[PDB]
Write an enzyme that holds these catalytic residues in place. Sequence first.
Site, PDB file in Angstrom:
ATOM      1  N   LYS A   7       1.101  -0.797   0.108  1.00  0.00           N
ATOM      2  CA  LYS A   7       0.132  -0.197   0.118  1.00  0.00           C
ATOM      3  C   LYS A   7       0.861   1.338  -0.267  1.00  0.00           C
ATOM      4  O   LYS A   7       0.988   1.964  -0.683  1.00  0.00           O
ATOM      5  CB  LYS A   7      -1.138   0.267   0.937  1.00  0.00           C
ATOM      6  N   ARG A  10       2.383   1.605  -3.603  1.00  0.00           N
ATOM      7  CA  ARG A  10       1.336   2.273  -4.568  1.00  0.00           C
ATOM      8  C   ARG A  10       0.993   3.548  -4.002  1.00  0.00           C
ATOM      9  O   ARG A  10       0.583   4.775  -4.634  1.00  0.00           O
ATOM     10  CB  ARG A  10       0.455   1.521  -4.226  1.00  0.00           C
ATOM     11  N   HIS A  12       2.892   5.878  -2.360  1.00  0.00           N
ATOM     12  CA  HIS A  12       3.351   6.751  -2.309  1.00  0.00           C
ATOM     13  C   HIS A  12       4.661   7.303  -2.399  1.00  0.00           C
ATOM     14  O   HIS A  12       5.844   7.683  -2.609  1.00  0.00           O
ATOM     15  CB  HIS A  12       4.073   6.724  -0.539  1.00  0.00           C
ATOM     16  N   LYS A  41      -9.436  11.091  -2.429  1.00  0.00           N
ATOM     17  CA  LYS A  41      -8.807  11.835  -1.719  1.00  0.00           C
ATOM     18  C   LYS A  41      -7.992  12.724  -1.396  1.00  0.00           C
ATOM     19  O   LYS A  41      -7.631  13.309  -2.291  1.00  0.00           O
ATOM     20  CB  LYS A  41      -6.969  10.402  -1.152  1.00  0.00           C
ATOM     21  N   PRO A  42      -8.547  13.341   0.218  1.00  0.00           N
ATOM     22  CA  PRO A  42      -8.129  14.867   0.102  1.00  0.00           C
ATOM     23  C   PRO A  42      -6.298  15.758  -0.321  1.00  0.00           C
ATOM     24  O   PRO A  42      -6.168  16.633  -0.833  1.00  0.00           O
ATOM     25  CB  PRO A  42      -8.529  15.180   0.936  1.00  0.00           C
ATOM     26  N   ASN A  44      -1.664  13.767  -0.575  1.00  0.00           N
ATOM     27  CA  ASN A  44      -1.664  12.822  -0.752  1.00  0.00           C
ATOM     28  C   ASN A  44       0.333  13.320  -0.970  1.00  0.00           C
ATOM     29  O   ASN A  44      -0.142  14.835  -1.663  1.00  0.00           O
ATOM     30  CB  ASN A  44      -1.587  11.915  -2.258  1.00  0.00           C
ATOM     31  N   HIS A 119       3.559   3.869   6.892  1.00  0.00           N
ATOM     32  CA  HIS A 119       2.939   5.473   6.667  1.00  0.00           C
ATOM     33  C   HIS A 119       3.368   6.371   6.704  1.00  0.00           C
ATOM     34  O   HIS A 119       4.661   6.427   6.894  1.00  0.00           O
ATOM     35  CB  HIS A 119       1.859   5.237   7.991  1.00  0.00           C
ATOM     36  N   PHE A 120       2.991   7.343   5.566  1.00  0.00           N
ATOM     37  CA  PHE A 120       3.838   8.434   5.150  1.00  0.00           C
ATOM     38  C   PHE A 120       3.424   9.834   6.063  1.00  0.00           C
ATOM     39  O   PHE A 120       1.570   9.802   6.350  1.00  0.00           O
ATOM     40  CB  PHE A 120       3.160   9.251   4.339  1.00  0.00           C
ATOM     41  N   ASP A 121       4.010  10.384   6.824  1.00  0.00           N
ATOM     42  CA  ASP A 121       3.436  10.598   8.608  1.00  0.00           C
ATOM     43  C   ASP A 121       2.774  12.705   8.370  1.00  0.00           C
ATOM     44  O   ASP A 121       2.553  13.526   8.143  1.00  0.00           O
ATOM     45  CB  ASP A 121       4.113  10.774   9.274  1.00  0.00           C
TER      46      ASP A 121
END
EC number: 4.6.1.18
Lengths: 124, 175
Positions: A7, A10, A12, A41-42, A44, A119-121
């Site tokens: 995920k 894909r 990031h 998605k708002p 990214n 995750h990207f933080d």
Amino acid sequence: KETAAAKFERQHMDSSTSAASSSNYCNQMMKSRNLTKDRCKPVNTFVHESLADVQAVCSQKNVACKNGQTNCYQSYSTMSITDCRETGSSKYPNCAYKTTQANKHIIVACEGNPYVPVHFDASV
Amino acid sequence: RRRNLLRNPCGEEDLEGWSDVEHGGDGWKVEELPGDNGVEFTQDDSVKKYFASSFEWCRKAQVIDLQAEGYWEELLDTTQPAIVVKDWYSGRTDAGSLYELTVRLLSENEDVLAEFATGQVAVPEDGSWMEISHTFIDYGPGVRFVRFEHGGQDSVYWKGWFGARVTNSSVWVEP
Ligand SMILES: *[C@@H]1O[C@H](CO)[C@@H](O[C@@H]2O[C@H](CO)[C@@H](O[C@@H]3O[C@H](CO[C@H]4O[C@H](CO)[C@@H](O)[C@H](O)[C@@H]4O)[C@@H](O)[C@H](O[C@H]4O[C@H](CO)[C@@H](O)[C@H](O)[C@@H]4O)[C@@H]3O)[C@H](O)[C@H]2NC(C)=O)[C@H](O)[C@H]1NC(C)=O
């Protein structure tokens, strides 16, 4: 499923490019990586480094995630990145975006074994 | 000379015979040869259909019981005949995909006594068919089952059936 690691790839990673390649980049990447699947998605971010380099961040400066956990890592170098933000007047299924070039340290959250970004933080 | 112990190797009978079917993405789909954007199957004209994977891992197995199929304990133990596994796989010429094959010999307690396993591998991007073959020998006593599992997915995260393609699978016993 798809793992919470593919995920992250894909959503990031874009290793094949150096930096954003025109102002239309967010429109295309949000589409082709399927962040517009049922909703827009708002927000990214994409990262224009090799996957390796981004893997590495996991063993670098440990910081507080912006949600106050533990397992977040700032990168030592700053990286080539692109923020994507909905345009006012984006409406699903014509999702539309603003591209923003940047070069900053990124903060990812890693987990599991192997220890990979999950995750990207934040970017700094 | 020799009999395939795997039910429904090519999806002639949709998914009957296969168990632990994992439908990733838009699941498995049986299609006909040569499929949408893939090369001709050159070397067994009796094969008209492969199974296609989607955008998340699709898997499927069969657990073959050596006795239900006609062999017996002391035969397996003293003669220790060769057990041969083949599989066929490809990818589309317009997307890449990944394949994986894991084949194991089980005791009746179902302890793995021998394994043959690819890891997940990149399917030739020219779309060409790959045969993959192992022969198990001197595996020792108490082999009761052969478990055969393979799977696929695309490496492009597309909707549809752009994953690896599998077909003509076989396991058999031989002198
Ligand atoms: C998430 O992201 C997007 C949502 O838009 C989707 O991306 C599209 O995926 C579709 C199919 O699912 C892609 O369709 C396929 O395109 C193939 C390759 O074409 C490329 O190259 C040609 C040059 O000839 C150009 O036309 C174009 O720029 C393409 O990038 C075609 O080969 C395919 O057609 C063949 O296969 C189908 C069989 O299914 C047959 O019908 C055809 O006759 C032919 O044999 C196919 O059409 C599409 O390209 C994708 N967009 C892009 C660029 O990413 C993902 O599908 C979606 N995934 C998920 C998980 O939802």
